[PDB]
Design an enzyme around this catalytic site. Structure first.
Site, mmCIF file in Angstrom:
data_model
loop_
_atom_site.group_PDB
_atom_site.id
_atom_site.type_symbol
_atom_site.label_atom_id
_atom_site.label_comp_id
_atom_site.label_asym_id
_atom_site.label_seq_id
_atom_site.Cartn_x
_atom_site.Cartn_y
_atom_site.Cartn_z
ATOM 1 N N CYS A 70 35.389 42.010 50.173
ATOM 2 C CA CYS A 70 34.169 42.694 50.581
ATOM 3 C C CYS A 70 34.362 43.239 51.985
ATOM 4 C CB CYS A 70 33.003 41.693 50.595
ATOM 5 S SG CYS A 70 31.385 42.412 51.034
ATOM 6 N N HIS A 108 24.977 42.416 46.500
ATOM 7 C CA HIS A 108 24.554 42.755 47.855
ATOM 8 C C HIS A 108 23.059 43.044 47.843
ATOM 9 C CE1 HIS A 108 28.167 42.954 50.270
ATOM 10 N NE2 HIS A 108 28.754 43.807 49.459
ATOM 11 N N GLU A 155 28.108 45.076 43.908
ATOM 12 C CA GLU A 155 27.104 45.865 44.652
ATOM 13 C C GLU A 155 25.690 45.385 44.376
ATOM 14 O OE1 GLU A 155 28.602 47.230 46.785
ATOM 15 O OE2 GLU A 155 30.529 47.659 45.790
HETATM 16 C C1 LIG Z 1 35.430 45.135 43.436
HETATM 17 C C2 LIG Z 1 34.440 45.636 44.465
HETATM 18 C C3 LIG Z 1 35.014 45.640 45.878
HETATM 19 C C4 LIG Z 1 34.010 46.342 46.804
HETATM 20 C C5 LIG Z 1 34.509 46.437 48.249
HETATM 21 C C6 LIG Z 1 33.514 47.237 49.099
HETATM 22 N N1 LIG Z 1 32.246 46.532 49.248
HETATM 23 O O1 LIG Z 1 32.240 45.425 50.103
HETATM 24 C C7 LIG Z 1 31.253 46.953 48.616
HETATM 25 O O2 LIG Z 1 30.321 46.256 48.585
HETATM 26 C C8 LIG Z 1 35.841 47.157 48.393
HETATM 27 O O3 LIG Z 1 35.936 48.331 48.079
HETATM 28 N N2 LIG Z 1 36.881 46.497 48.919
HETATM 29 C C9 LIG Z 1 36.953 45.100 49.377
HETATM 30 C C10 LIG Z 1 38.456 44.855 49.522
HETATM 31 C C11 LIG Z 1 39.026 46.216 49.899
HETATM 32 C C12 LIG Z 1 38.162 47.186 49.105
HETATM 33 C C13 LIG Z 1 38.799 47.389 47.791
HETATM 34 N N3 LIG Z 1 38.842 46.636 46.663
HETATM 35 C C14 LIG Z 1 39.590 47.308 45.735
HETATM 36 C C15 LIG Z 1 39.966 47.037 44.425
HETATM 37 C C16 LIG Z 1 40.743 47.998 43.783
HETATM 38 C C17 LIG Z 1 41.118 49.189 44.404
HETATM 39 C C18 LIG Z 1 40.733 49.465 45.714
HETATM 40 C C19 LIG Z 1 39.967 48.492 46.340
HETATM 41 O O4 LIG Z 1 39.471 48.563 47.648
HETATM 42 NI NI NI Z 2 30.805 44.123 49.463
#
Ligand SMILES: CCCC[C@H](CN(O)C=O)C(=O)N1CCC[C@H]1c1nc2ccccc2o1
Ligand code: NI
Ligand SMILES: CCCC[C@H](CN(O)C=O)C(=O)N1CCC[C@H]1c1nc2ccccc2o1
Ligand SMILES: CCCC[C@H](CN(O)C=O)C(=O)N1CCC[C@H]1c1nc2ccccc2o1
Length: 196
Positions: A105, A151, A148
């Site tokens: 996250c 959250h 999401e």
């Molecule tokens: C599986 C959902 C992960 C959501 C998170 C963003 N977030 O906190 C939304 O609420 C995110 O994009 N992350 C958290 C780790 C890095 C990045 C991420 N996770 C991935 C998983 C696959 C491909 C690209 C990715 O990029």
């Molecule tokens: Ni998140």
């Protein structure tokens, strides 16, 4: 705009969001477009596949996403859902698999832990035009939808961790000095915390 992402400990992350206003005639708030644009810009700068409004300090029930893998082919790759309602398949209580279940996250930057999720999920709500939208998928896309909505309900994926995974995470949060208010990071200014 690209704006700060709040870190675990900030009250806005740990309480349920307020639904977005929809008038009787179907109209959304005229200034919603600007908030949505900031959510996209911030998600993008943070190299995210999703971003919930409360992660940028806005306690409103919406999220944006840009997440290709495992989505139903009827789902857009990139979009927004206003007032999402989450449906899932069976949420497993077995120990997550370290080789397939890892999840992180942006509000817990630089960390990830194996997290149990339903294999399939659907979110319904409204798009930016106020039209009904329904998106669904399995695997990563379903994980994103659950994350999401989590959250928006006032939870972090940390709240889902069990056993050795929860233990490992608790110490990590403590060691960062997180879990107190006022902490944030700024994508595009601060270094990318996920090596991205
Ligand atoms: C599986 C959902 C992960 C959501 C998170 C963003 N977030 O906190 C939304 O609420 C995110 O994009 N992350 C958290 C780790 C890095 C990045 C991420 N996770 C991935 C998983 C696959 C491909 C690209 C990715 O990029
Ligand atoms: Ni998140
Ligand atoms: C909760 C975040 C505020 C969203 C808001 C949406 N918008 O475009 C205007 O309504 C925004 O981006 N704002 C509101 C003021 C300018 C810009 C903004 N807010 C910031 C907060 C910190 C750093 C840069 C920032 O840029
Ligand atoms: C009913 C709360 C939603 C109003 C507002 C939406 N917004 O400004 C973003 O567009 C918001 O989140 N606000 C306005 C003041 C501070 C912040 C806020 N509302 C909270 C409610 C609970 C915990 C932290 C909160 O932080």
């Amino acid at each position: 705009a690209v704006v700060p992402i709040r870190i675990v400990g900030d009250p806005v992350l740990h309480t349920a969001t307020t639904p977005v206003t929809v008038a009787a005639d179907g109209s959304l708030p005229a200034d919603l477009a600007q908030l949505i644009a900031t959510m996209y810009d911030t998600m993008d700068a943070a190299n995210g596949v999703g971003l919930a409004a409360n992660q940028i300090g806005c306690s409103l029930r919406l999220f944006v996403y840009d997440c290709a893998a495992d989505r139903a082919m009827t789902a857009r790759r990139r979009g927004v859902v206003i007032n999402p309602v989450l449906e899932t398949s069976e949420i497993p209580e077995t120990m997550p698999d370290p080789d397939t279940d890892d999840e992180g996250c942006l509000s817990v930057p630089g960390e990830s832990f194996p997290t149990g999720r339903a294999k399939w999920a659907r979110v319904t709500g409204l798009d930016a035009d106020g039209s009904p939208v329904s998106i669904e998928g399995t695997g990563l896309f379903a994980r994103m939808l659950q994350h999401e909505t989590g959250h928006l309900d006032g939870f972090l994926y940390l709240d889902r961790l069990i056993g050795r995974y929860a233990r490992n995470a608790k110490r990590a949060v403590k060691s960062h000095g997180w879990g107190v208010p006022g902490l944030s990071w700024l994508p595009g200014e601060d270094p990318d915390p996920f090596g991205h």
